[PDB]
Design a protein around this ligand. Structure first.
Ligand SMILES: CCCCCCCCCCCCCCCCCC(=O)OC[C@H](COP(=O)(O)OCCN)OC(=O)CCCCCCCCCCCCCCCCC
Ligand SMILES: CCCCCCCCCCCCCCCCCC(=O)OC[C@H](COP(=O)(O)OCCN)OC(=O)CCCCCCCCCCCCCCCCC
Ligand SMILES: CCCCCCCCCCCCCCCCCC(=O)OC[C@H](COP(=O)(O)OCCN)OC(=O)CCCCCCCCCCCCCCCCC
Ligand SMILES: CCCCCCCCCCCCCCCCCC(=O)OC[C@H](COP(=O)(O)OCCN)OC(=O)CCCCCCCCCCCCCCCCC
Ligand SMILES: CCCCCCCCCCCCCCCCCC(=O)OC[C@H](COP(=O)(O)OCCN)OC(=O)CCCCCCCCCCCCCCCCC
Ligand SMILES: CCCCCCCCCCCCCCCCCC(=O)OC[C@H](COP(=O)(O)OCCN)OC(=O)CCCCCCCCCCCCCCCCC
Ligand SMILES: CCCCCCCCCCCCCCCCCC(=O)OC[C@H](COP(=O)(O)OCCN)OC(=O)CCCCCCCCCCCCCCCCC
Ligand SMILES: CCCCCCCCCCCCCCCCCCCC
Ligand SMILES: CCCCCCCCCCCCCCCCCCCC
Ligand SMILES: CCCCCCCCCCCCCCCCCCCC
Ligand SMILES: CCCCCCCCCCCCCCCCCCCC
Lengths: 478, 162, 314, 100, 102, 299
C-alpha cells in the first residue's frame, strides 16, 4: 500500500520524533550543549504529544501493510511519550554530574521513544520486530551510559546478551509462523486453518518462541532473571524508562497481536499464558519479600504487575473489557512507576562519579525530603493496589476481567500476590518515616513531575471516571 | 540445485559445530566465515540471490571483519581459555547439549507436521526485493536507518579510548 | 557422444578456461610490464636483456621463486599463513569471473554481477588481515590493521560509486550494464561515480598511493602469490572500470575484444603512471579523504542520478 | 524440489548449535559469536519460508535481521572492549557482582 | 536451457581451476628447491563505522536496481534515508569520531 | 650533574676510552665469540629493555608502547636506531641510538701525516667531498703560514659549489622519495652524473676526490673543463624547475611536509642548529658571508 497525505497525518508522532532525532543530532554536531539539546529533545517529544490530537482527528486507518493507527495506538503513543518526557526530565539533573558527554543520552531516549511509537502502531511481524529492537538497542546504550561504573557495565552486558538471545528466539518464531501461514500481518496468523485445526504444531511452535522473546521483554517468568540486575545497575532515569516505556510498548503490541491473530483464540496458548501469568505473579511477589534495595524491589514489582497485566490479557478473546482494563492498569502503573523511579532518580542526582556508590538509603527520608517521602509512600500504596489509589482501580479492573472469564486460579494468584506485595510495599513506606543517622530549576521540574504523578494517582484513585472514559474512547479496530 | 543445498547445509552445520567447540578465536572466526559462505550457498540454491549476495557482502564481509579486528586488538593468546578447556569437560557441556537436543527434537517434531509442496527455487531478484522495500516496507527502511543510527551512537559512546 | 548440447557445453567451458589462463598470464606479464613502463616513465629501459626485450624475465623470477627455499615462521599459524596468499590471488580472480570481454565470451552471466565483485572484495580484505596476524610479528600486525582500516574506509563507498551505473542500467547484470552504454559511455553521466570508483579501486587493490609491513615474513612462492594476485587485481579492476564506465567492448570499427583490450591496457598503463607520478599522502589524510569527501560524493551522485532518471521517464 | 521442512530443520539445527555455544562458553567473545550464529540461523529460516511462498518478504526480513545483527555486533564488541579495558579479562562469570 | 547449464559448468570449472592452480603453485613452491603493542580503539571505531554504513549501503543497493519501478515516492523515501545517513556522517565527523589524529 | 652519562659512540660494554693517547688505535683481533655474544645481546635487547638507562621515565601508563626503527635503514642517510615511546601514534619520547657508524676519524687524525689525512677528511660527510676537504686544508695552511693564490681560491670554491649542488640534489631527491614520489630521484641522479663528469675530469674521481692540497690543489685544471661546466650550467635550471613543478609544488607533498617538525630561532640556537635549518628561522648566518674564507667575498 502507498502513502497518502492523510496517512502522513496519521504518521505524525513518528515523523516528529524522527525529525527530533535528526535535529538533535545536527545540533550536537554544531556544538555540544547539554541544555539546548535536552530542550530540543523535550520540545520534539511535546510536539509529538500534541500532534496526537491531529492524529485523532485524522481518523483510524491502515498506514502501511505494516502500521495501523487507531485509538489504541494513540493511547500507547501518549503513554510512551509521557514516559520519555519524564525520563528526559529526570535525566538532566543526573547528567549535570556526568563528566563525559551528556548529549547522546537524549538521542538514545528519542530513538527508543520512536521504537515505542512504532510498537504502538504495529500491525505486522516486521514492524513488531523492528519496534522491539528500536526500543532495545538505545536501551543497551542507556543502561550502560555510565560504563565506567562497574554495575552499569554489568547491567549493560547482561541486557545486551540476553536481549540479543531473545531477539533471535523471537525472529526464529516469526520465521516458523511465516512458514506456516505465508503472510506476516497479524490478522493472517492462523487464517489458513479451519474445522477446528487452529492448533497447527508449526504455528504453535513459532508463537511459543515469540512468547519466549516477548516474555523476556515483559520480565515474565521464566524469562525474568535479568530484571533486578539491569534495574539496579542502570542509571536511575534509565531505570525509569526501562520500567515504564519499554514494558508499556511491548505489552501494547502483544495485546494487539493476540487480539488480531486467529491463533490468539487457541486453548494451548491460553493455558501456557495462564501458567506464565500465575508463576509471574507469585514469583515476582515472593522474590521481593526480603529486598533492601529499592531498584531490585521495583524490578520484582514489575514482574508481578506484568503478571497481573497478562491475566487481563488472557481474557481478551472472552470478555469485552479486557483491553479497557489493560489501558486503565497501564495508566496507573505508568504514573506509579514514574513517581517511584523519579524519587529514586532525584535522590540519586547529580551523578556522583563512577567510584562512589549510588545506594539509596530511603530510611528517614521524611526528615530531610518530606515531599519526596510523601510521593514515594503514595507510589508504594499505589503499587500495592490499596484503595484511594489508581493502582487499586487497575487491580479492580484485572479482578473483574478475571471473574468475568472464570479464571479462578489467576484470581487466587492475584489475591495472594497482592498480600505479599502489601507486606514489602508497606515495609518500604513505613521505612520512609523512621529515623536514620538540587538548587536549580531542572531538579525542581523533576520534583514537580513526581508530585504531579502522586496527585494524579490520588485523584484518579478516588475519581477514576475520566480515565475510564478516556480509555474507553481509545477503541481499536474490530 | 538440491545437491548444492544439502552439501552447503552440511558444510554450514559442520563448520558451526567446529565454531562452538574451538579454543582459538581466529580459527573459530574462520570456521564461522566458512559456515556463512555455506549459508550463502544455501540462499543461492533457494533462489534468494540478493540474500546470498548480502550474506557474503555484509555478514561475511563486514561483521566478521569487525569480529576479526577486535580479536587482533585484544591479542587473544588463549589466556585462561586454552589453559582450562572448561567447555571440553563433559560435566560442563552435557547439560546444555541435552537441553539443546531436546529443543531441537521439539522444533523438528513441530516442523515435520506442516504442509510442504516443496521449494521451487525460482530466483527472486534484488529488483523485486527493492520494489517491496521501498513500497510496502517503507517504514521498515526508515526506522532501520534509525536503528543503525542508534547502534552507531551506542557503539561510539561505549567504544572510545580517551 | 556427438551432440550439439555437449559440444556447446565443452565450448563454453573451453572459453572460460581460456579467459582464466589469459588473465593469469596477463597478471604475470603485468608485473613485467610494470617494470618496463616504470622504466619508460623514468627515462630508462627496465629489464631488456633476459630474452628478447626482457620478455623472458618473468619466467626467470617464476623459476627463482619456485626454487627458492620454502620457509614458514616457527611460531606462526601455518594454515592462516598459507591461506592469506590464497585469498589475495583467488578473490579478485573470481571477481574477474563476471567480466564480459566480448559478446558471447563471458564465464558467468550472473544476475548479481558487481554484487559478486563486492563479495570478492569484502572477502579480499581477509588476505591482509590473515597475513598480518599469522606472521607472529607485531610490526606486521600493526601494518595489517592500518592497511585493513584504509581498505574498509574505501570499501565503504566502492559499491555506492557503482550504484549510479547500476541505477542507469536498471540491473546488476554486466551485459545489461554494457548494453546501456551503447550510445554514451557511463564516464560522461557517472563521472563522479567514475572518479570515486577509481579512487576506491586503487585503494582496495593496495596500489600507490595507498600502499610495519605485513609481507616481510612471506618469501618464496607465497610472496609471488601475493604479487601475482595484486597484478591480477589490477587487471580485474581495470576491466571492471572499462565495462562499467567505458562501454565495455563497444566501439565503432575494431573488433569488440580489441576495443576491450585497448581500454583495459590504457587503464593498466594509468595504474603504472599513477604509481610513477603521485606522492603518498599521510594515513589520517587518506582515511579522512575516504570518509569525508568520497562517500558523501557517492551518495549525492546516486541521488542526482535517480532524480535525472525519474525526470527523464515521462 | 527442495522440501520446506529440510530448510527449516537446517535452520533449527544451526539455531540450537548457536544457543549451545552461547551457553557453554565462558568467554564473552564466544558468546557474541554464538549470538551471531543464532540470529543468522533465524534469518536463514525466514529466507527458507520466503522462498517456499515465493515472496520477497523473507529476504526483507533477512535484511532487517542482518541490520539488527550488525548493530548488535557493534554494541557487543564495544562492551567487550570496555570489559577488556577495565578488567583485563573476558570471563563472563566474573561479571556477576549484582545478585539476590 | 542449454546455455545456462553450459554457463554453470563453465563457472564451476573456472572456480575449480583457479583454486587448483593456486594450490598447485603453493605445492610446487613447497616441493622444489633445497633447504638450509596495544592497538587503539580507533581501529574498532573505523571498522564499526564501515559495518554500519555498509548495511545502509545494502539498502541503497536494493533501491538502485529498481529506481524506475519505485517512482518519485521511492525517490522521496531514499532521499530521507540518505539525509539520515549524511546527518549521521556529519555528526561523526564533527565530534571527532572520524579524526584519526587527536 | 649529567642526566645520563652513558657511552654514545662505543657500545656500553666497552673497556677504555679510545681518544686517550695510551689507547691503541688499530683494530683488535676479530673473535667470533664476541660477535656471538653481541648477537645474543642484540636478540635479548627486546626482552631486557629497561626504560631508565636511556634517560626516559614512566616505562609502561599501561599504554605507552615501544618501537624500534633500526639498525637496518634502507636509505642514503645511514643506519641508526631510534627507540620510540608511543601513545597510540603520538611520540611521547624518543632517544636516538648512534655510534653504529663510528670510524675513529679523529684518532686516525692522530695517526696520519698532515698530507696523508686528506682522504680521511673526504669520508666525514661522504656526500660533500671537496667541501669536506676545504676546512681541513685551510686549517693546516693556517698552521703552515700559507696564503694560497687567487686561482687556488677560485678552483676550490668551484669544486665546493659543484659538490654542494651534488649533495643538495641528492637531499631533495631523497626527501621527495621519502614523501612518496619515486620518479624525480632518477633525473636528479642524472644531473649528479653531469656533475660527476666534470668532477671526474678535474680530479680523477667521483665521490672522494681527495684533490685539495696543503697550499693548493693536486693538479691544474685540465684543458677543456669549461665546456663541461658550461654544459652542466645549461642542463641544470630546466631540470630544477621541472622537479619543482612535478614534486615540490604537489599539495600532497606539501601536506606531508608543511608544519611538520617546526621550531623557531631560539630552539635552533639552543641546539646548535646550522645550515638551512637555522636560516629558515630567519637568522642570517652563513659562514661564506659572516666569516668569509677561500675568496668567497669576490662572488
Ligand atoms: C527543516 C524542516 C523543519 C525542521 C524543524 C523546524 C526548525 C528547527 C530549528 C532548530 C534550531 C536549533 C538551534 C536553536 C538555537 C538557539 C540558540 C539560543 O538562543 O540558545 C540560547 C540557549 C542556550 O543554552 P543556555 O545554556 O541557556 O545558554 C546560556 C547563554 N545565553 O538555548 C535556549 O534557551 C533554548 C532555545 C530553544 C530555541 C528553539 C525552540 C524551538 C525548536 C523547534 C524545533 C524542535 C523540534 C521540532 C520537531 C517538529 C515539530 C513539528
Ligand atoms: C479462613 C481461611 C481461608 C481464607 C483466608 C483469607 C485471607 C485472609 C485471612 C488470613 C490471613 C493470613 C495472613 C498470615 C500472615 C500475616 C502477615 C504477617 O505475619 O506478617 C508479618 C511477617 C513479618 O514479621 P516477622 O515474622 O518478624 O518477619 C521476620 C522477617 N525478617 O511477614 C512475613 O513474614 C511475610 C508476609 C508475607 C505475606 C503474608 C502471607 C500471604 C499468604 C497468602 C495470603 C492470602 C490468603 C490465602 C490463604 C492462606 C491460608 C488460609
Ligand atoms: C563435491 C563434494 C564436496 C566437496 C567439498 C566441498 C566443496 C564445495 C561444495 C559446495 C559448493 C558447490 C556445490 C555444488 C554446486 C554445483 C552447481 C549446481 O549444483 O548448480 C545448481 C544451481 C544452479 O542454479 P539453478 O538455476 O537453481 O539451477 C537449476 C538448473 N536450471 O546452483 C545454485 O542454485 C547454487 C549453486 C551453489 C551455491 C554457490 C557456491 C557456494 C559455495 C559455498 C562454499 C562454502 C565453504 C566451503 C569450504 C570448504 C572447505 C572447508
Ligand atoms: C578515442 C575515440 C573513442 C571513440 C568512442 O568512444 O567511440 C565509441 C562511441 C561512438 O558511438 P557509437 O554509437 O558506438 O558509434 C558507432 C556507431 N554505432 O562513443 C561513445 O559512446 C562516447 C564515448 C565518449 C568517451 C569520452 C572519454 C574517452 C576517454 C578519454
Ligand atoms: C557543498 C555541498 C555539496 C554540494 C554537492 C557536491 C556533490 C555534487 C555531485 C554531483 C553529481 C552529479 C551527477 C549527474 C548525473 C546526471 C546524468 C545522468 O545520470 O543521466 C542519466 C541518463 C541515462 O539514463 P536513462 O536516460 O534513463 O537511460 C536508460 C534509458 N531508459 O544519462 C543521459 O541521458 C546522458 C546525460 C549526460 C549528462 C552529462 C553532464 C552531467 C554529468 C557530468 C558532469 C561533469 C562535471 C565536471 C566537473 C564540474 C565541477 C565540479
Ligand atoms: C580456497 C577456496 C575457498 C572456497 C571457494 C569456493 C568453494 C566452492 C568451489 C566450487 C564451486 C562449484 C560451482 C558452484 C556453482 C556455480 C554456478 C552458480 O553459482 O550457479 C547459480 C547461480 C546462477 O545464476 P544464473 O543462472 O545466472 O541465474 C538465473 C537463473 N538460472 O549463480 C549464483 O548464484 C552466483 C553466486 C554464487 C557464486 C559463488 C562463488 C564462490 C564464493 C566463495 C568464494 C571464496 C573465496 C576464497 C575464500 C575467501 C576467504 C574465506
Ligand atoms: C582502473 C581504475 C584505476 C585506474 C587509474 C586511474 C585512477 C587513479 C586514482 C588515484 C586516486 C588517488 C587519490 C589520492 C587522494 C589523496 C587525498 C589526501 O589525503 O590528500 C591530502 C592533501 C593534503 O590534505 P590536507 O588535509 O589539506 O593537509 C594539509 C596540511 N598541511 O590534500 C590535497 O592535496 C587535496 C587534493 C587531494 C587529491 C584529490 C584527488 C586526486 C586524485 C588523483 C588524480 C587523478 C587524476 C586523473 C587520473 C586519470 C583517471 C583516468
Ligand atoms: C491511601 C492513599 C494515600 C493516603 C495518604 C498517604 C500519605 C501521604 C503523605 C501525607 C503527609 C505525610 C506526613 C507524615 C508525618 C509523620 C510524622 C511521624 C512522627 C512520629
Ligand atoms: C497461591 C494461589 C492459589 C489460588 C487457588 C485458586 C483455586 C481456584 C480453584 C478453581 C476450581 C474451579 C473448578 C471448576
Ligand atoms: C558459574 C555459573 C554456571 C551456570 C551454568 C548453568 C548450566 C545450566 C544447565 C542446564 C541443564 C539442563 C538439562 C536438561 C534438564 C531437563 C530438560 C529441561 C526441562 C524439562
Ligand atoms: C587484458 C585483457 C584480458 C582478457 C582476458 C580474456 C581474453 C579472451 C580472449 C577472447 C578472444 C576472442 C573474442 C571473440 C572474437 C572477437 C575478437 C576477434 C579478434 C581478437
Amino acid at each position: 500500500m502507498t502513502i497518502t497525505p492523510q496517512n502522513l497525518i496519521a504518521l505524525l508522532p513518528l515523523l516528529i520524533v524522527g525529525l527530533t532525532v535528526v535535529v538533535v543530532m545536527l545540533s550536537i554536531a554544531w556544538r555540544r550543549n547539554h541544555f539546548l539539546n535536552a530542550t530540543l529533545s523535550v520540545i520534539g517529544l511535546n510536539a509529538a504529544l500534541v500532534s496526537l490530537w491531529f492524529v485523532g482527528q485524522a481518523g483510524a486507518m491502515d498506514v502501511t501493510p505494516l502500521m495501523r493507527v487507531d485509538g489504541f495506538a494513540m493511547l500507547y503513543t501518549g503513554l510512551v511519550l509521557l514516559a520519555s518526557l519524564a525520563t528526559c526530565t529526570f535525566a538532566y539533573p543526573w547528567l549535570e554530574g556526568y563528566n563525559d558527554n551528556k548529549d547522546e543520552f537524549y538521542l538514545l531516549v528519542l530513538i527508543a521513544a520512536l521504537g515505542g511509537i512504532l510498537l504502538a502502531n504495529a500491525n505486522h511481524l516486521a514492524s513488531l520486530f523492528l519496534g522491539i529492537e528500536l526500543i532495545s538497542l538505545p536501551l543497551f546504550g542507556l543502561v550502560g551510559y555510565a560504563f565506567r561504573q562497574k554495575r552499569s557495565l554489568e547491567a549493560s552486558i547482561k541486557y545486551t546478551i540476553l536481549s540479543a538471545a531473545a531477539s533471535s528466539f523471537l525472529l526464529f518464531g516469526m520465521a516458523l509462523v511465516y512458514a506456516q501461514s505465508g503472510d506476516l500481518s497479524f490478522v493472517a496468523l492462523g487464517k489458513n486453518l479451519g474445522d477446528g485445526m487452529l492448533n497447527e504444531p508449526l504455528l504453535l511452535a513459532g508463537f511459543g518462541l515469540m512468547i519466549v522473546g516477548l516474555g523476556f521483554k515483559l520480565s515474565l517468568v521464566p524469562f525474568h532473571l535479568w530484571t533486578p540486575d539491569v534495574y539496579q545497575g542502570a542509571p536511575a532515569p534509565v531505570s525509569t524508562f526501562l520500567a515504564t516505556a519499554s514494558k508499556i510498548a511491548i505489552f501494547g503490541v502483544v495485546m494487539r497481536l493476540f487480539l488480531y491473530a486467529p491463533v490468539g483464540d487457541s486453548e494451548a496458548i491460553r493455558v501456557v499464558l495462564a501458567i506464565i501469568a500465575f508463576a509471574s505473579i507469585i514469583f515476582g511477589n515472593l522474590m521481593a519479600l526480603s529486598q533492601t534495595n529499592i531498584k531490585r524491589l521495583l524490578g520484582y514489582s514489575s514482574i508481578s504487575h506484568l503478571g497481573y497485566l497478562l491475566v487481563a490479557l488472557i481474557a481478551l478473546q472472552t470478555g469485552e473489557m479486557s483491553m479497557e482494563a489493560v489501558g486503565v492498569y497501564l495508566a496507573g502503573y505508568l504514573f506509579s512507576s514514574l513517581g517511584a523511579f523519579g524519587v529514586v532518580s532525584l535522590m540519586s542526582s547529580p551523578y556522583r562519579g563512577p567510584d562512589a556508590d549510588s545506594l539509596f538509603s530511603y530510611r528517614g527520608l521524611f526528615w530531610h525530603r518530606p515531599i519526596l517521602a510523601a510521593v514515594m509512600t503514595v507510589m508504594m500504596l499505589s503499587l500495592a493496589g490499596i484503595p484511594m489509589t489508581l493502582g487499586f482501580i487497575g487491580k479492580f479492573y484485572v479482578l473483574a476481567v478475571g471473574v468475568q472469564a472464570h479464571l479462578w486460579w489467576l484470581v487466587g494468584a492475584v489475591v495472594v500476590g497482592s498480600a505479599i506485595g502489601l507486606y514489602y510495599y508497606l515495609r518500604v513506606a513505613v521505612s520512609l518515616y523512621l529515623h536514620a543517622p538540587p538548587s536549580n530549576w531542572q531538579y525542581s521540574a523533576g520534583g514537580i513531575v513526581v508530585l504531579i504523578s502522586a496527585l494524579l494517582v490520588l485523584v484518579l484513585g478516588v475519581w477514576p471516571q475520566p480515565l475510564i472514559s478516556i480509555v474507553r474512547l481509545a477503541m481499536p479496530l474490530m | 540445485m538440491e545437491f548444492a543445498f544439502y552439501i552447503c547445509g552440511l558444510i554450514a552445520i559442520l563448520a558451526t559445530l567446529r565454531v562452538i567447540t574451538h579454543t582459538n578465536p581466529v580459527h573459530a572466526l574462520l570456521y564461522l566465515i566458512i559456515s556463512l559462505l555455506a549459508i550463502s550457498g544455501v540462499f543461492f540454491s533457494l533462489g534468494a540471490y540478493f540474500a546470498g549476495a548480502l550474506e557474503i557482502i555484509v555478514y561475511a564481509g563486514a561483521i566478521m571483519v569487525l569480529f576479526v579486528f577486535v580479536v587482533m586488538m585484544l591479542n587473544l593468546g588463549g589466556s585462561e581459555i586454552e589453559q582450562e578447556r572448561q567447555w571440553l569437560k563433559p560435566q560442563v557441556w552435557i547439560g546444555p547439549a541435552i537441553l539443546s537436543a531436546i529443543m531441537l527434537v521439539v522444533i523438528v517434531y513441530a516442523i515435520l507436521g506442516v504442509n510442504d509442496q516443496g521449494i521451487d527455487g525460482t530466483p527472486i531478484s534484488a529488483k523485486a526485493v527493492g520494489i517491496t522495500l521501498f513500497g510496502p516496507y517503507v517504514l521498515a527502511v526508515e526506522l532501520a536507518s534509525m536503528l543503525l543510527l542508534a547502534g552507531l551512537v551506542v557503539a561510539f559512546h561505549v567504544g572510545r579510548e580517551e | 557422444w556427438i551432440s550439439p548440447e555437449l559440444i556447446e557445453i565443452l565450448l563454453t567451458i573451453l572459453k572460460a578456461v581460456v579467459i582464466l589462463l589469459v588473465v593469469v598470464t596477463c597478471g604475470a606479464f603485468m608485473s613485467f610490464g610494470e617494470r618496463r613502463l616504470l622504466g619508460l616513465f623514468q627515462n630508462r629501459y627496465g629489464p631488456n636483456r633476459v630474452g628478447w626485450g626482457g620478455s623472458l624475465q618473468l619466467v626467470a623470477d617464476m623459476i627463482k621463486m619456485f626454487f627458492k627455499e620454502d620457509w614458514i615462521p616457527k611460531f606462526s599459524d601455518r594454515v592462516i599463513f598459507t591461506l592469506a596468499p590464497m585469498i589475495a590471488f583467488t578473490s579478485l580472480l573470481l571477481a574477474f569471473a563476471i567480466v564480459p570481454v566480448s559478446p558471447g565470451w563471458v564465464v558467468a552471466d550472473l544476475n548479481i554481477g558487481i554484487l559478486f565483485f563486492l563479495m570478492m572484495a569484502g572477502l579480499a580484505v581477509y588476505a591482509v588481515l590473515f597475513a598480518g596476524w599469522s606472521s607472529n610479528n607485531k610490526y606486521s600486525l600493526l601494518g595489517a590493521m592500518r592497511a585493513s582500516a584504509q581498505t574498509l574506509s574505501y570499501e565503504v563507498f566502492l559499491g555506492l560509486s557503482l550504484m549510479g551505473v547500476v541505477a542507469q542500467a536498471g540491473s546488476f547484470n554486466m551485459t545489461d550494464i554494457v548494453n546501456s552504454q551503447a550510445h554514451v559511455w557511463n564516464v560522461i553521466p557517472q563521472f563522479f561515480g567514475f572518479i570515486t570508483f577509481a579512487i576506491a579501486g586503487v585503494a582496495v587493490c593496495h596500489r600507490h598511493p595507498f600502499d610495519d609491513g605485513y609481507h616481510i615474513e612471506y618469501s618464496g612462492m607465497k610472496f609471488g602469490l601475493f604479487f601475482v594476485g595484486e597484478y591480477i587485481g589490477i587487471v580485474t579492476i581495470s576491466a571492471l572500470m572499462v565495462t562499467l564506465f567505458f562501454g565495455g567492448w563497444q566501439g565503432p570499427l575494431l573488433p569488440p575484444f580489441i576495443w576491450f583490450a585497448l581500454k583495459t591496457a590504457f587503464f593498466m598503463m594509468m595504474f603504472i603512471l599513477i604509481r610513477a607520478s603521485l606522492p603518498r599522502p599521510r594515513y589520517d589524510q587518506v582515511m579522512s579523504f575516504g570518509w569525508k569527501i568520497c562517500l558523501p560524493l557517492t551518495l549525492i551522485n546516486l541521488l542526482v542520478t535517480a532524480a535525472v532518471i525519474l525526470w527523464q521517464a515521462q | 524440489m527442495i522440501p520446506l521442512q529440510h530448510g527449516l530443520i537446517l535452520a533449527a539445527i544451526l539455531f540450537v548449535l548457536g544457543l549451545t555455544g552461547l551457553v557453554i562458553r565462558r568467554n564473552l567473545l564466544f558468546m557474541l559469536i554464538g549470538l551471531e550464529i543464532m540470529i543468522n540461523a533465524s534469518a536463514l529460516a525466514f529466507v527458507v519460508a520466503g522462498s517456499y511462498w515465493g515472496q520477497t518478504d523473507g529476504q526483507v526480513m533477512y535484511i532487517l535481521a542482518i541490520s539488527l545483527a550488525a548493530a548488535e555486533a557493534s554494541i557487543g564488541l564495544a562492551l567487550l572492549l570496555q570489559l577488556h579495558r577495565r578488567r583485563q579479562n573476558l570471563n563472563i562469570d566474573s561479571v556477576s557482582e549484582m545478585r539476590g | 536451457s542449454t546455455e545456462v547449464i553450459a554457463h554453470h559448468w563453465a563457472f564451476a570449472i573456472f572456480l575449480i581451476v583457479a583454486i587448483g592452480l593456486c594450490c598447485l603453485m603453493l605445492v610446487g613452491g613447497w616441493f622444489l628447491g633445497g633447504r638450509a603493542l596495544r592497538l587503539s580503539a580507533k581501529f574498532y571505531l573505523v571498522a564499526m563505522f564501515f559495518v554500519i554504513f555498509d548495511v545502509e549501503a545494502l539498502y541503497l543497493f536494493a533501491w538502485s536496481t529498481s529506481i524506475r519501478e519505485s517512482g518519485w515516492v521511492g525517490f522521496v523515501e531514499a532521499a530521507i534515508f540518505i539525509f539520515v545517513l549524511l546527518a549521521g556522517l556529519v555528526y561523526l565527523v564533527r565530534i571527532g569520531a572520524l579524526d584519526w589524529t587527536p | 650533574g649529567h642526566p645520563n652519562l652513558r657511552r654514545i659512540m662505543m657500545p656500553q660494554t666497552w673497556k677504555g676510552h679510545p681518544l686517550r693517547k695510551d689507547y691503541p688505535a688499530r683494530a683488535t683481533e676479530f673473535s667470533p665469540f664476541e660477535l656471538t655474544k653481541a648477537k645474543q645481546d642484540l636478540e635479548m635487547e627486546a626482552l631486557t629493555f629497561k626504560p631508565e638507562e636511556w634517560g626516559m621515565k614512566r616505562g609502561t601508563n599501561e599504554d605507552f608502547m615501544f618501537l624500534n626503527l633500526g639498525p637496518n635503514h634502507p636509505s642514503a642517510h645511514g643506519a641508526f636506531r631510534i627507540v620510540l615511546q608511543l601513545d597510540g601514534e603520538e611520540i611521547v619520547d624518543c632517544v636516538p641510538d648512534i655510534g653504529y657508524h663510528h670510524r675513529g676519524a679523529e684518532k686516525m687524525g692522530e695517526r696520519q701525516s698532515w698530507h696523508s689525512y686528506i682522504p680521511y677528511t673526504d669520508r666525514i660527510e661522504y656526500l660533500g667531498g671537496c667541501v669536506n676537504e676545504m676546512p681541513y686544508v685551510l686549517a693546516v695552511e693556517k698552521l703552515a703560514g700559507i696564503t694560497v693564490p687567487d686561482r687556488v681560491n677560485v678552483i676550490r670554491v668551484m669544486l665546493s659549489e659543484l659538490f654542494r649542488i651534488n649533495s643538495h640534489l641528492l637531499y631533495i631527491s631523497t626527501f621527495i622519495q621519502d614523501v612518496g614520489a619515486m620518479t624525480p630521484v632518477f633525473f636528479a641522479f642524472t644531473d649528479r652524473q653531469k656533475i660527476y663528469d666534470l668532477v671526474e675530469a678535474i680530479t680523477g674521481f667521483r665521490m672522494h676526490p681527495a684533490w685539495f692540497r696543503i697550499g693548493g690543489v693536486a693538479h691544474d685544471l685540465p684543458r677543456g673543463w669549461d665546456r663541461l661546466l658550461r654544459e652542466f650550467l645549461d642542463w641544470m635550471p630546466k631540470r630544477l624547475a621541472s622537479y619543482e613543478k612535478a614534486a615540490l609544488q604537489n599539495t600532497i607533498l606539501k601536506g606531508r611536509s608543511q608544519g611538520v617538525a617546526a621550531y623557531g630561532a631560539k630552539e635552533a640556537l639552543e641546539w646548535g642548529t646550522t645550515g638551512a635549518g637555522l636560516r629558515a628561522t630567519g637568522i642570517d648566518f652563513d659562514v661564506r658571508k659572516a666569516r668569509p674564507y677561500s675568496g668567497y667575498e669576490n662572488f
